Design an enzyme around this catalytic site. Structure first.
Site, PDB file in Angstrom:
ATOM      1  N   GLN A  64      -3.787 -17.385  -3.038  1.00  0.00           N
ATOM      2  CA  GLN A  64      -4.121 -16.641  -4.266  1.00  0.00           C
ATOM      3  C   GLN A  64      -5.257 -17.320  -5.042  1.00  0.00           C
ATOM      4  O   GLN A  64      -6.043 -16.640  -5.709  1.00  0.00           O
ATOM      5  CB  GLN A  64      -2.929 -16.504  -5.233  1.00  0.00           C
ATOM      6  CG  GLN A  64      -1.933 -15.392  -4.984  1.00  0.00           C
ATOM      7  CD  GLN A  64      -2.575 -14.067  -4.635  1.00  0.00           C
ATOM      8  OE1 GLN A  64      -2.359 -13.551  -3.546  1.00  0.00           O
ATOM      9  NE2 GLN A  64      -3.376 -13.529  -5.541  1.00  0.00           N
ATOM     10  N   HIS A 121       0.835   1.308  -5.806  1.00  0.00           N
ATOM     11  CA  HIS A 121      -0.529   0.761  -5.849  1.00  0.00           C
ATOM     12  C   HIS A 121      -1.505   1.868  -6.186  1.00  0.00           C
ATOM     13  O   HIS A 121      -2.400   1.634  -6.978  1.00  0.00           O
ATOM     14  CB  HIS A 121      -0.913   0.131  -4.504  1.00  0.00           C
ATOM     15  CG  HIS A 121      -2.360  -0.268  -4.376  1.00  0.00           C
ATOM     16  ND1 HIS A 121      -2.878  -1.423  -4.937  1.00  0.00           N
ATOM     17  CD2 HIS A 121      -3.365   0.276  -3.648  1.00  0.00           C
ATOM     18  CE1 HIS A 121      -4.161  -1.516  -4.636  1.00  0.00           C
ATOM     19  NE2 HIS A 121      -4.481  -0.503  -3.845  1.00  0.00           N
ATOM     20  N   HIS A 167       0.829  -1.199   0.000  1.00  0.00           N
ATOM     21  CA  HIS A 167       0.000   0.000   0.000  1.00  0.00           C
ATOM     22  C   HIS A 167       0.877   1.269   0.000  1.00  0.00           C
ATOM     23  O   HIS A 167       0.775   2.116   0.898  1.00  0.00           O
ATOM     24  CB  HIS A 167      -0.932  -0.026   1.220  1.00  0.00           C
ATOM     25  CG  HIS A 167      -2.033  -1.030   1.101  1.00  0.00           C
ATOM     26  ND1 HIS A 167      -2.011  -2.252   1.749  1.00  0.00           N
ATOM     27  CD2 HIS A 167      -3.192  -0.993   0.402  1.00  0.00           C
ATOM     28  CE1 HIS A 167      -3.111  -2.921   1.443  1.00  0.00           C
ATOM     29  NE2 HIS A 167      -3.848  -2.169   0.647  1.00  0.00           N
ATOM     30  N   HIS A 217      -7.179   6.705  -2.632  1.00  0.00           N
ATOM     31  CA  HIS A 217      -8.008   5.749  -1.939  1.00  0.00           C
ATOM     32  C   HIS A 217      -7.225   5.031  -0.864  1.00  0.00           C
ATOM     33  O   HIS A 217      -7.848   4.500  -0.041  1.00  0.00           O
ATOM     34  CB  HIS A 217      -8.721   4.736  -2.880  1.00  0.00           C
ATOM     35  CG  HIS A 217      -7.870   3.591  -3.265  1.00  0.00           C
ATOM     36  ND1 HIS A 217      -6.832   3.720  -4.158  1.00  0.00           N
ATOM     37  CD2 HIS A 217      -7.811   2.320  -2.774  1.00  0.00           C
ATOM     38  CE1 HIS A 217      -6.192   2.557  -4.223  1.00  0.00           C
ATOM     39  NE2 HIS A 217      -6.765   1.700  -3.387  1.00  0.00           N
ATOM     40  N   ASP A 218      -5.897   5.005  -0.861  1.00  0.00           N
ATOM     41  CA  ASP A 218      -5.152   4.338   0.226  1.00  0.00           C
ATOM     42  C   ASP A 218      -4.072   5.191   0.866  1.00  0.00           C
ATOM     43  O   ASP A 218      -3.103   4.651   1.468  1.00  0.00           O
ATOM     44  CB  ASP A 218      -4.461   3.099  -0.275  1.00  0.00           C
ATOM     45  CG  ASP A 218      -5.338   1.860  -0.264  1.00  0.00           C
ATOM     46  OD1 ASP A 218      -6.260   1.695   0.589  1.00  0.00           O
ATOM     47  OD2 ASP A 218      -5.118   0.966  -1.104  1.00  0.00           O
ATOM     48  N   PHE A 228      -8.344 -16.490  -3.011  1.00  0.00           N
ATOM     49  CA  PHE A 228      -8.606 -15.090  -3.292  1.00  0.00           C
ATOM     50  C   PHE A 228      -9.302 -14.921  -4.633  1.00  0.00           C
ATOM     51  O   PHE A 228     -10.283 -14.185  -4.727  1.00  0.00           O
ATOM     52  CB  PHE A 228      -7.303 -14.285  -3.261  1.00  0.00           C
ATOM     53  CG  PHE A 228      -7.492 -12.794  -3.463  1.00  0.00           C
ATOM     54  CD1 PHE A 228      -8.448 -12.093  -2.747  1.00  0.00           C
ATOM     55  CD2 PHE A 228      -6.678 -12.093  -4.367  1.00  0.00           C
ATOM     56  CE1 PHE A 228      -8.599 -10.732  -2.927  1.00  0.00           C
ATOM     57  CE2 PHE A 228      -6.827 -10.714  -4.555  1.00  0.00           C
ATOM     58  CZ  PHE A 228      -7.787 -10.044  -3.836  1.00  0.00           C
ATOM     59  N   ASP A 238      -9.137  -1.557  -7.758  1.00  0.00           N
ATOM     60  CA  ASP A 238      -8.437  -1.964  -6.550  1.00  0.00           C
ATOM     61  C   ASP A 238      -8.055  -3.449  -6.513  1.00  0.00           C
ATOM     62  O   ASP A 238      -6.953  -3.806  -6.141  1.00  0.00           O
ATOM     63  CB  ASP A 238      -9.285  -1.613  -5.310  1.00  0.00           C
ATOM     64  CG  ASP A 238      -8.448  -1.550  -4.032  1.00  0.00           C
ATOM     65  OD1 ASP A 238      -8.981  -1.628  -2.904  1.00  0.00           O
ATOM     66  OD2 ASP A 238      -7.233  -1.414  -4.079  1.00  0.00           O
TER      67      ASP A 238
HETATM   68  C1  VIA Z   1      -5.227 -13.454   0.348  1.00  0.00           C
HETATM   69  C2  VIA Z   1      -5.211 -12.718  -0.961  1.00  0.00           C
HETATM   70  C3  VIA Z   1      -3.905 -12.011  -1.149  1.00  0.00           C
HETATM   71  C4  VIA Z   1      -3.965 -10.919  -2.126  1.00  0.00           C
HETATM   72  N1  VIA Z   1      -3.292 -10.809  -3.310  1.00  0.00           N
HETATM   73  N2  VIA Z   1      -3.610  -9.654  -3.898  1.00  0.00           N
HETATM   74  C5  VIA Z   1      -3.057  -9.252  -5.176  1.00  0.00           C
HETATM   75  C6  VIA Z   1      -4.525  -8.944  -3.099  1.00  0.00           C
HETATM   76  C7  VIA Z   1      -5.230  -7.660  -3.212  1.00  0.00           C
HETATM   77  O1  VIA Z   1      -5.128  -6.850  -4.155  1.00  0.00           O
HETATM   78  N3  VIA Z   1      -6.091  -7.378  -2.116  1.00  0.00           N
HETATM   79  C8  VIA Z   1      -6.233  -8.278  -1.021  1.00  0.00           C
HETATM   80  C9  VIA Z   1      -7.137  -7.958   0.122  1.00  0.00           C
HETATM   81  C10 VIA Z   1      -7.877  -9.018   0.666  1.00  0.00           C
HETATM   82  C11 VIA Z   1      -8.754  -8.850   1.755  1.00  0.00           C
HETATM   83  S1  VIA Z   1      -9.661 -10.166   2.382  1.00  0.00           S
HETATM   84  O2  VIA Z   1     -10.960  -9.691   2.671  1.00  0.00           O
HETATM   85  O3  VIA Z   1      -9.585 -11.234   1.459  1.00  0.00           O
HETATM   86  N4  VIA Z   1      -8.896 -10.649   3.755  1.00  0.00           N
HETATM   87  C12 VIA Z   1      -9.371 -10.276   5.078  1.00  0.00           C
HETATM   88  C13 VIA Z   1      -8.972 -11.230   6.227  1.00  0.00           C
HETATM   89  N5  VIA Z   1      -7.554 -11.528   6.217  1.00  0.00           N
HETATM   90  C14 VIA Z   1      -7.117 -12.326   7.346  1.00  0.00           C
HETATM   91  C15 VIA Z   1      -7.126 -12.032   4.918  1.00  0.00           C
HETATM   92  C16 VIA Z   1      -7.519 -11.101   3.745  1.00  0.00           C
HETATM   93  C17 VIA Z   1      -8.850  -7.547   2.295  1.00  0.00           C
HETATM   94  C18 VIA Z   1      -8.114  -6.473   1.784  1.00  0.00           C
HETATM   95  C19 VIA Z   1      -7.234  -6.652   0.684  1.00  0.00           C
HETATM   96  O4  VIA Z   1      -6.441  -5.691   0.089  1.00  0.00           O
HETATM   97  C20 VIA Z   1      -6.656  -4.288   0.310  1.00  0.00           C
HETATM   98  C21 VIA Z   1      -7.889  -3.899  -0.479  1.00  0.00           C
HETATM   99  N6  VIA Z   1      -5.607  -9.435  -0.913  1.00  0.00           N
HETATM  100  C22 VIA Z   1      -4.768  -9.758  -1.942  1.00  0.00           C
HETATM  101 MG    MG Z   2      -7.928   0.327   0.704  1.00  0.00          MG
HETATM  102 ZN    ZN Z   3      -6.189  -0.264  -2.524  1.00  0.00          ZN
END
Ligand code: VIA
Ligand code: MG
Ligand code: ZN
EC number: 3.1.4.53
Length: 322
Positions: free
Chosen positions: A280, A77, A73, A113-114, A283, A229
């Site tokens: 991933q 990004h 972040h 946004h971040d 995700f 995002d």
């Molecule tokens: C686990 C996925 C890792 C990941 N790779 N990339 C490229 C991203 C991304 O762009 N954003 C997020 C992301 C995931 C969550 S999540 O809801 O999947 N989550 C919440 C709970 N934790 C413990 C794990 C992640 C929350 C915020 C994130 O990024 C900022 C926007 N994860 C990944």
């Molecule tokens: Mg954010």
């Molecule tokens: Zn972001």
């Protein structure tokens, strides 16, 4: 390291832009750089009478409030999200749909946004009783903060890039930016996916989309910036793996901060247990694909290219698990 920069900027309007390359050839100012490039390409400095030196100084300063020492972040990004938004805003299916004010808003939102992100989640800040959770009463803590910092940097005249907007246009732009950045809070993902599905199921056209009123237009814009995002895994695999590596360094950095303090560590932020590759895939299957398939539906066929790549990358990561 200046002609290379112009070479890389030819892909400004393409999903295939390499933001890490522009970060390198811009003396590590990828956000200032890409935001100036985008504003020129859309004639926004002329359309909204933004002085060029005012814009540069604002952006250099907003970028300076993205922390260099956080893996994901940082201003790389913000730059990626701004530029990704810039491309989606040009999707043929949305051609003439948004005002220039709406376009300005979306891009500015992506850029901020971040901003000032500490490299930890809303949940961590809440469970450690941080000053920010107290400020914001546990609700969209970071996202509220990012909006506050972004708008606070506009307070000064030497930096108010929205100075020559109508008073009414500053109010709408502000209402729209607030709405779009708050929409990047991931605990609103499902709520946003549901609403995007409802609009696919009731979509009108010409082959350009019909959006009747503001509620429709800002609901697409919220989902656009959220897609931007969460677009890392729809990029070409070379870029996606660098983003995966950044986000995961950050997440493991946070699990270490959780371990130091005796709180429970969430499996995915555990560097001793967690599979980067499986996380991933998860995700992608549970969050990114469901979202981009729906966005793809709404703009078809414009996003089919992105969807194939997403799926390809997903399969690549799956076939990296033993
Ligand atoms: C686990 C996925 C890792 C990941 N790779 N990339 C490229 C991203 C991304 O762009 N954003 C997020 C992301 C995931 C969550 S999540 O809801 O999947 N989550 C919440 C709970 N934790 C413990 C794990 C992640 C929350 C915020 C994130 O990024 C900022 C926007 N994860 C990944
Ligand atoms: Mg954010
Ligand atoms: Zn972001």
């Amino acid at each position: 390291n200046e002609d290379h920069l112009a070479k890389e900027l030819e892909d400004l309007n393409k999903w295939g832009l390499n933001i890490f390359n522009v970060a390198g050839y811009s003396h590590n100012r990828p956000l200032t750089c890409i935001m100036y490039a985008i504003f020129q390409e859309r004639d926004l400095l002329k359309t909204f009478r933004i002085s060029s030196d005012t814009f540069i100084t604002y952006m250099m300063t907003l970028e300076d409030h993205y922390h260099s020492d956080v893996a994901y972040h940082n201003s790389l990004h913000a730059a990626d999200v701004a530029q990704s938004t810039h491309v989606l805003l040009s999707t043929p299916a949305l051609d003439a749909v948004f005002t220039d004010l709406e376009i300005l808003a979306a891009i500015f939102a992506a850029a901020i946004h971040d901003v000032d992100h500490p490299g930890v989640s809303n949940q961590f800040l809440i469970n450690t009783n941080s000053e920010l959770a107290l400020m914001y009463n546990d609700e969209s803590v970071l996202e509220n903060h990012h909006l506050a910092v972004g708008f606070k940097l506009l307070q000064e005249e030497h930096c108010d890039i929205f100075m020559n907007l109508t008073k009414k246009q500053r109010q709408t732009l502000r209402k729209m930016v607030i709405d779009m950045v708050l929409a990047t809070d991931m605990s609103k993902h499902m709520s946003l996916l549901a609403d995007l599905k409802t609009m696919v199921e009731t979509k009108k056209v010409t082959g350009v989309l019909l959006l009747d009123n503001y509620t429709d237009r800002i609901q697409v814009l919220r989902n656009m910036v959220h897609c931007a995002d969460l677009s890392n895994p729809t990029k070409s695999l070379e870029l996606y793996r660098q983003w995966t590596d950044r986000i995961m360094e950050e997440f493991f950095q946070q699990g270490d901060k959780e371990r130091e303090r005796g709180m429970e560590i969430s499996p995915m932020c555990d560097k001793h247990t967690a599979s980067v590759e499986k996380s991933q895939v998860g995700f992608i299957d549970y969050i990114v694909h469901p979202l981009w398939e729906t966005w793809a539906d709404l703009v078809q066929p414009d996003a089919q290219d992105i969807l194939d790549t997403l799926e390809d990358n997903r399969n690549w990561y799956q076939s990296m698990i033993p």
